[PDB]
Design a binder for this molecule. Structure first.
Ligand SMILES: [Cl-]
Length: 98
């Protein structure tokens, strides 16, 4: 998945998203370096800032950022927030470019 980044800290994710070639809505998902199975979504917004969202785990293996809408997988979460912001700072646009 072009949006999933391996072995990144929060500050690494921030630097990657603030790099030239990214813009409003540029995003990635990473795993916590400290907590196995805990994922987060990082999104570039506009000074120019990166917002982080905790992806919460359902016992059945699904995911949510807001309890209003849950997803059976990260692909479905990304597709949903690519369609509309639905409570995030902005609509997801392009996966983080390296
Ligand atoms: Cl959050």
């Amino acid at each position: 998945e072009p949006w999933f980044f391996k072995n990144l800290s929060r500050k690494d994710a921030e630097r990657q998203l603030l790099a030239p070639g990214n813009t409003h809505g540029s995003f990635l998902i990473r795993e916590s370096e400290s907590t196995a199975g805990s994922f987060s979504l990082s999104v570039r917004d506009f000074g120019e800032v990166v917002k982080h969202y905790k992806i919460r785990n359902l016992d059945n293996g699904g995911f949510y950022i807001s309890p209003r809408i849950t997803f059976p997988g990260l692909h479905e979460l990304v597709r949903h927030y690519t369609n509309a912001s639905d409570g995030l700072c902005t609509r997801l646009s392009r996966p983080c470019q390296t």
